[PDB]
Enzyme design. Structure first.
Site, PDB file in Angstrom:
ATOM      1  N   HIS A   1      -5.446   5.535  -0.192  1.00 32.57           N
ATOM      2  CA  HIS A   1      -6.550   5.191  -1.354  1.00 32.57           C
ATOM      3  C   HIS A   1      -8.028   5.301  -0.746  1.00 32.57           C
ATOM      4  O   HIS A   1      -9.025   4.435  -0.725  1.00 32.57           O
ATOM      5  CB  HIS A   1      -6.655   3.614  -1.980  1.00 32.57           C
ATOM      6  CG  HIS A   1      -5.227   3.642  -2.542  1.00 32.57           C
ATOM      7  ND1 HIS A   1      -4.312   2.837  -2.179  1.00 32.57           N
ATOM      8  CD2 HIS A   1      -4.946   4.020  -3.767  1.00 32.57           C
ATOM      9  CE1 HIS A   1      -3.079   3.102  -3.259  1.00 32.57           C
ATOM     10  NE2 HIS A   1      -3.791   3.769  -4.139  1.00 32.57           N
TER      11      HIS A   1
ATOM     12  N   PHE B   1      11.160   5.920  -5.842  1.00 34.36           N
ATOM     13  CA  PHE B   1       9.883   6.025  -6.568  1.00 34.36           C
ATOM     14  C   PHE B   1       9.964   7.228  -7.570  1.00 34.36           C
ATOM     15  O   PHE B   1       9.536   6.826  -8.826  1.00 34.36           O
ATOM     16  CB  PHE B   1       8.597   6.393  -5.507  1.00 34.36           C
ATOM     17  CG  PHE B   1       7.455   6.632  -6.055  1.00 34.36           C
ATOM     18  CD1 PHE B   1       6.908   5.635  -6.765  1.00 34.36           C
ATOM     19  CD2 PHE B   1       6.623   7.709  -5.542  1.00 34.36           C
ATOM     20  CE1 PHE B   1       5.581   6.125  -7.176  1.00 34.36           C
ATOM     21  CE2 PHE B   1       5.451   7.981  -5.987  1.00 34.36           C
ATOM     22  CZ  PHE B   1       4.913   7.005  -6.654  1.00 34.36           C
TER      23      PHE B   1
ATOM     24  N   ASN C   1       1.912  13.156  -6.629  1.00 37.08           N
ATOM     25  CA  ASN C   1       1.944  13.524  -5.152  1.00 37.08           C
ATOM     26  C   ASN C   1       3.342  13.924  -5.249  1.00 37.08           C
ATOM     27  O   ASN C   1       3.519  15.324  -4.626  1.00 37.08           O
ATOM     28  CB  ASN C   1       2.106  12.338  -4.208  1.00 37.08           C
ATOM     29  CG  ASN C   1       0.383  11.759  -4.154  1.00 37.08           C
ATOM     30  OD1 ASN C   1       0.544  10.693  -3.551  1.00 37.08           O
ATOM     31  ND2 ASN C   1      -0.409  12.512  -4.301  1.00 37.08           N
TER      32      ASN C   1
HETATM   33  C1  LIG Z   1       3.152   9.613  -1.986  1.00 41.58           C
HETATM   34  O1  LIG Z   1       4.210   8.286  -2.175  1.00 41.58           O
HETATM   35  C2  LIG Z   1       3.573   7.402  -2.944  1.00 41.58           C
HETATM   36  C3  LIG Z   1       2.146   7.672  -3.670  1.00 41.58           C
HETATM   37  C4  LIG Z   1       1.838   6.405  -4.835  1.00 41.58           C
HETATM   38  C5  LIG Z   1       2.532   5.358  -4.884  1.00 41.58           C
HETATM   39  C6  LIG Z   1       2.286   4.177  -5.670  1.00 41.58           C
HETATM   40  C7  LIG Z   1       1.378   4.296  -6.893  1.00 41.58           C
HETATM   41  N1  LIG Z   1       3.029   3.150  -5.529  1.00 41.58           N
HETATM   42  O2  LIG Z   1       2.922   2.110  -6.600  1.00 41.58           O
HETATM   43  C8  LIG Z   1       3.897   0.926  -5.810  1.00 41.58           C
HETATM   44  C9  LIG Z   1       5.194   0.754  -6.781  1.00 41.58           C
HETATM   45  C10 LIG Z   1       6.154   1.530  -6.119  1.00 41.58           C
HETATM   46  O3  LIG Z   1       6.047   2.306  -5.486  1.00 41.58           O
HETATM   47  N2  LIG Z   1       7.465   1.160  -6.658  1.00 41.58           N
HETATM   48  C11 LIG Z   1       7.934  -0.108  -7.620  1.00 41.58           C
HETATM   49  C12 LIG Z   1       9.114   0.257  -8.378  1.00 41.58           C
HETATM   50  O4  LIG Z   1      10.249   0.799  -7.827  1.00 41.58           O
HETATM   51  C13 LIG Z   1      10.010   2.227  -6.999  1.00 41.58           C
HETATM   52  C14 LIG Z   1       8.818   1.813  -6.116  1.00 41.58           C
HETATM   53  C15 LIG Z   1       3.668   5.182  -4.192  1.00 41.58           C
HETATM   54  C16 LIG Z   1       4.090   6.379  -3.484  1.00 41.58           C
HETATM   55  O5  LIG Z   1       5.398   6.065  -2.695  1.00 41.58           O
HETATM   56  C17 LIG Z   1       5.628   4.597  -2.406  1.00 41.58           C
HETATM   57  C18 LIG Z   1       6.967   4.253  -3.113  1.00 41.58           C
HETATM   58  C19 LIG Z   1       7.822   4.725  -2.155  1.00 41.58           C
HETATM   59  C20 LIG Z   1       7.252   4.282  -0.725  1.00 41.58           C
HETATM   60  C21 LIG Z   1       5.992   4.500  -0.837  1.00 41.58           C
HETATM   61 MG   LIG Z   2      -5.668   2.457  -8.593  1.00 36.63          MG
HETATM   62 ZN   LIG Z   3      -5.143   6.140  -7.524  1.00 32.82          ZN
END
Ligand SMILES: COc1ccc(/C(C)=N/OCCC(=O)N2CCOCC2)cc1OC1CCCC1
Ligand SMILES: [Mg+2]
Ligand SMILES: [Zn+2]
Ligand SMILES: COc1ccc(/C(C)=N/OCCC(=O)N2CCOCC2)cc1OC1CCCC1
Ligand SMILES: [Mg+2]
Ligand SMILES: [Mg+2]
Ligand SMILES: [Mg+2]
Ligand SMILES: [Mg+2]
Ligand SMILES: [Mg+2]
Ligand SMILES: [Mg+2]
Ligand SMILES: [Mg+2]
Ligand SMILES: [Zn+2]
Lengths: 332, 327
Positions: free
Chosen positions: B73, B285, B234
């Site tokens: 971030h 995700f 992403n």
């Molecule tokens: C490049 O990768 C990522 C980029 C952004 C995000 C975000 C916005 N994450 O917000 C958290 C909520 C979330 O991820 N959840 C909650 C529901 O079930 C599925 C998982 C997450 C990313 O990958 C994460 C998930 C896989 C390991 C790291």
């Molecule tokens: Mg944000």
């Molecule tokens: Zn953001």
């Protein structure tokens, strides 16, 4: 001290505090008799009457220290949104909670949340509206992105004061009790934003249409949603209770809100802004405005509350109608 | 070398810009460089009489307020969301739909949407009784803070890029930006998605095939979801970009998990460096968040986003391929 503060005669203050369970407690006299500590005196009395110190292991010196600190953060030079209004809303919620239709409905933690939310719900109020804070690009409106600006601030201050020396009245709640109380208090104080009044009332009418009641009239609430909705509307009704009070109290509340509104309009006039509705001391119709306030806001709300708790609020409604007639009859 | 940077910025209108390369070449100024390029490309400086030196001053101070030691971030993520929003705004299904002020609001919202992010989640800030959660009553804690900081920086010396907007335009932009950044809170995702699905169901298109968005509610809903999609883009990028983003988010999550472990707290899901799989977490995700959102955006603008959705589906198939599975 007997009532949480020093007073030139507790005997007179005691006689007045016997009405703490009654609508129309003489809250301005309590303020005078307590050396302008109505919020501390009334909260102390209510916590003792409801046995909340023992239930939640709140040390009494901690309660008094927090209440004095909280009362000090209500502005002495604001005519309406001051410690007397906070004390009034607390005491009015305390009466509403005891209404027969709500017997044994709420837990002690829900009762504590409603009372605490009432006590903090306007703390550090500056005497100007959310829209004024938005229109003048205030730091507060910048902090809160123009949304429930004051109500978010009252909550943040009331919770922050718990962190002052010997002020944490919730120190002996469990971790989950603290979390639950915090959530309820936020839900209740955010519902005092008047921009939410119409949606809140519409939802309350829907609850009234489908109310479940025992044989004797006691409401049956099923879950958090039901319970928090009644508590939100209860404290909103208490915040909007001035016109339902004995007329001499109502008359003083009207004088105070108009003094505060006129001071805001003066600030608007000085900055070349449009003067807000009912804040122009040069073009005011105080009596007409009270009747309009009752017709469009206060009676619609209280007629719906009265429906929910029928017949518990019948005399409050009758007083509202008599008080409407007073202001109608004094329109020049 | 300023030569190579101009070559990289040639792709600013394409999905898959090499934003990490731009970050290196610009001296860790991807947000300033990409915002400036996009403002020039869309002629925003002339439309809104923004002095070029004011723009650069604001963008540099905004970029300064993204934290270098936060692995995901940071200013590179801000620049990526800006550029992705810039691409989505030009999707053929939305041609001439949005006013210049709406375009400016969506790009500005993207630029500020994570400013001063501390590298921990809202739930962490709530559960640790942080001062930020105390200020914001546990509700969209970070997103309220990003907005307040992004607007506050307009007050610095020669930083008001909206100085020549009319009063009415400024009030409209402020509202729109608030509405957009608050919609990036993931606790609003399911409600945003449920509503977007219903908007797709009943959508109206011109002759030309362009969406018809009559009132503010429908317009802002599309901008909210469009920036949310950019924030969640992403896994729709080429694998060499997506891999870098995945490395960064896991570093950030694991540092939060280390703080939860030190505090005796239950480690948040996907934050335990010892007991977590990258592959399962990314497939989850994509399956539960990213693909449900992007297939709905793709429905709204069909067929504009098919290549994006194709990459997403390819990347999901790729990351699941080394997870043993019953056949
Ligand atoms: C490049 O990768 C990522 C980029 C952004 C995000 C975000 C916005 N994450 O917000 C958290 C909520 C979330 O991820 N959840 C909650 C529901 O079930 C599925 C998982 C997450 C990313 O990958 C994460 C998930 C896989 C390991 C790291
Ligand atoms: Mg944000
Ligand atoms: Zn953001
Ligand atoms: C005794 O008369 C009044 C007492 C209180 C009020 C209110 C509600 N004032 O609102 C200011 C604070 C506010 O906005 N709140 C807090 C309450 O709930 C809504 C959100 C208004 C009164 O009369 C007004 C209307 C006719 C001209 C003066
Ligand atoms: Mg009991
Ligand atoms: Mg208030
Ligand atoms: Mg203890
Ligand atoms: Mg029910
Ligand atoms: Mg005139
Ligand atoms: Mg790698
Ligand atoms: Mg699917
Ligand atoms: Zn109030």
């Amino acid at each position: 001290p007997r009532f949480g503060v020093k007073t030139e005669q507790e005997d007179v203050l005691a006689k007045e505090l016997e009405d703490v369970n009654k609508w129309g407690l003489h809250v301005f006299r309590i303020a005078e008799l307590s050396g302008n500590r109505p919020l501390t005196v009334i909260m102390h009395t209510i916590f003792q009457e409801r046995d909340l110190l023992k239930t939640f292991k709140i040390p009494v010196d901690t309660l008094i220290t927090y209440l004095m600190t909280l009362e000090d953060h209500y502005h002495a030079d604001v005519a309406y949104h001051n410690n007397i209004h906070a004390a009034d809303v607390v005491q009015s919620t305390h009466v509403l909670l005891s209404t027969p239709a709500l017997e044994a409905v709420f837990t002690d933690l829900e009762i504590l949340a409603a009372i605490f939310a009432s006590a903090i719900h306007d703390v550090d109020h500056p005497g100007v509206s959310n829209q004024f804070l938005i229109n003048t690009n205030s730091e507060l409106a910048l902090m809160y992105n123009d949304s429930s600006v004051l109500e978010n601030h009252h909550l943040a201050v009331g919770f922050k004061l718990l962190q002052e020396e010997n002020c944490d009245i919730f120190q002996n709640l469990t971790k989950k009790q603290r979390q639950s109380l915090r959530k309820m208090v936020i839900d209740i104080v955010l519902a005092t934003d008047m921009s939410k009044h119409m949606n809140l009332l519409a939802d309350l009418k829907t609850m009234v249409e489908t109310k479940k009641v025992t044989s004797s009239g006691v409401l049956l609430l099923d879950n958090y949603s039901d319970r928090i909705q009644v508590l939100q509307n209860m404290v909103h009704c208490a915040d909007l209770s001035n016109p339902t009070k004995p007329l001499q109290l109502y008359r003083q509340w009207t004088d105070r809100i108009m003094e505060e509104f006129f001071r805001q309009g003066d600030r608007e006039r000085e900055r070349g802004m449009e003067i807000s509705p009912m804040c122009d001391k040069h073009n005011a119709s105080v009596e007409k405005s009270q009747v309009g306030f009752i017709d469009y806001i206060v009676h619609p709300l209280w007629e719906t509350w009265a429906d929910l708790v029928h017949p518990d609020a019948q005399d409050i409604l009758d007083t509202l109608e008599d008080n409407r007639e007073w202001y109608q009859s004094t329109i020049p």
